């Protein structure tokens, strides 16, 4: 796959490199994220990563974990993004494949994410990995248009 054939290095997110994630998020997403987002992303440990290409931080995947009463793990992908000059060369796939590999180590894992309903490019990207649109939430986002999201998910 495309993620297996790009020279990328992944690093975990910690307090010492948190500013890199904050800059990426400021550029990539119109949603403003607060301290709870950053605490959740760090607490997801191996599921949250920064991506480095040509020794520059160019993307990230940030997750939030929840343990269900069944004992199964639910993984939320909170954010996934790659800086525009470095898109289309496998970095997003590398980040997502890393999370999918971490999920395969937890039995009966399920993964959920939210995507704006007009983000046709991202929807196509996720469908390649086996994700499906399973729901729509009206008025999910406050200030952007459209305000609706798809809930996109994959079960293991």
């Amino acid at each position: 796959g495309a993620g297996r054939e790009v020279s990328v290095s992944l690093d975990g997110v910690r307090d010492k490199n948190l500013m890199q994630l904050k800059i990426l998020n400021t550029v990539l997403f119109p949603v403003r994220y607060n301290d709870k987002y950053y605490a959740d992303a760090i607490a997801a440990g191996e599921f949250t990563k920064l991506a480095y290409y040509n020794d520059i931080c160019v993307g990230a995947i940030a997750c939030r974990l929840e343990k269900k009463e069944s004992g199964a793990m639910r993984v939320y992908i909170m954010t996934l993004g790659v800086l525009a000059p470095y898109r289309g060369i496998g970095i997003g796939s590398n980040l997502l494949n890393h999370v999918l590999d971490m999920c395969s180590k937890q039995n009966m894992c399920e993964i959920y994410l939210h995507v704006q309903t007009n983000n046709e490019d991202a929807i196509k990207f996720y469908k390649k990995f086996g994700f499906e649109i399973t729901d729509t939430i009206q008025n999910y986002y406050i200030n952007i248009e459209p305000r609706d999201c798809y809930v996109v998910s994959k079960s293991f």
Binding site: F29, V31, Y33, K36, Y37, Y76
Partner: peptide, 5 residues
């Protein structure tokens, strides 16, 4: 892209 939280 999760909403603000």
């Amino acid at each position: 892209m999760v909403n603000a939280l």
